[PDB]
Amino acid sequence: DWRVLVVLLPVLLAAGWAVRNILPYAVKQVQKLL
Template sequence: MDFDWRLVVVLGPLLIAAGWAGFNIFAAALGQVQSFLNKNT
């Protein structure tokens, strides 16, 4: 059974981009939650 490297070539950049976007969104969301919690104390 041969491994098809075209799958990695196509999906690799998409997964990297999705991970980077998720990381940035998570960081912004975490900052907003911390700001909200600090306002209410």
């Protein structure tokens, strides 16, 4: 039902926001990992 999306939306946005600010630095890590 609808209450599940209301509960899940802040989490997705927080994970979305973290993925944005960190993506350039995560990509370097995967790489130096040859």
